[PDB]
């Protein structure tokens with residue numbers, strides 16, 4: 525199967541300058557392509573996965589991928605399809621983020637063989653480029669009227685928009701020059717990016733022709749949309765980060781389990797490296813069997829193993845099988861650290877708290893008298909087992925939370941009823 529044919533089978537080609545010439549080029553020889561990533565936070569999230577995965581899909585076919593970290597463009601800010609001005613980050617801020625997201629992109633690509641990936645930083649050439657040379661050597665090739673009519677910023681320019689500063693209005697010049705520079709340095713003849721990068725990609729296509737007299741191509745990936753209209757990574761708990769210390773592999777694994785039946789087969793094509801045929805068998809088995817669909821679990825296993833690793837997937841599976849389980853002895857200290865991060869509503873308690881005190885402190889009851897009914901109804905579980913009396917009282921301390929209930933001397937899973945429960949953390 526062709527490289528382009530594989531991407532269009534997955535619905536991964538949104539816009540491309542010449543699909544026939546790009547397809548014929550990839551079958552005739554191996555090329556170098558590049559994609560740019562701007563440091564806007566201390567870590568990436570799932571909304572950034574498509575471009576770096578698409579780079580890997582090209583590297584699998586023997587092409588050389590270039591991952592550009594925006595050490596310089598991150599100091600300006602991409603205004604493409606943004607209705608409000610981004611704020612300016614400090615040089616110290618961006619330099620740290622450059623090292624962070626660089627450590628997150630490198631695992632996705634191979635650095636062996638002739639097609640080994642290349643990590644680039646546009647601060648290498650902009651960090652020593654004088655402002656006059658910037659405005660002249662780059663700026664003379666840009667028409668302000670053409671810049672104003674770009675869809676990516678036209679909504680900001682109109683009378684209804686919030687306006688744009690000269691800073692962000694100049695961003696397409698930096699990203700445009702990156703394509704010409706990477707074409708000169710590493711023979712980059714293709715730039716891929718997110719769906720909102722069409723304006724800045726074609727700018728680097730034109731600029732590469734004017735500066736290097738070379739024909740290059742651009743391809744944008746689809747906007748990851750959901751069937752119900754909601755945003756892709758918007759969850760109740762926030763964003764689904766790639767850094768395990770921001771979102772636990774359990775919650776990462778949980779996010780992909782909850783994918784809708786309409787979205788799960790497209791997400792398998794977008795994000796996994798299972799073949800179109802393998803995904804086609806997964807879909808047909810679910811569509812023919814009257815049982816629950818298996819695609820969400822397969823999606824969750826593929827994404828957790830890819831981003832976090834095989835052991836972290838095992839941890840997420842072990843937590844998922846133990847959190848609502850009768851026997852929780854499988855949970856480890858690291859498993860509870862995941863739970864305290866974003867697995868369960870965590871609450872700090874100290875020695876001496878009884879059962880009804882923790883039942884209302886965690887929100888599992890409105891009042892203690894209401895929780896006292898839940899206690900005597902045998903509807904309260906501690907680490908999978910119902911609470912038992914263990915005191916000669918003093919009034920409500922008959923059900924006390926003593927050290928026996930402390931998992932690793934720090935954690936206790938408090939459960940009330942069939943659903944909804946909390947995590948106790950001992951200080």
Ligand SMILES: N[C@@H](Cc1ccc(O)cc1)C(=O)O
Pocket residue numbers: 559560561562592594597602646698699700702703717718721724
């Ligand atoms: N504009 C891209 C980042 C980028 C930076 C430099 C480039 O050459 C290309 C792309 C983004 O907003 O995500």
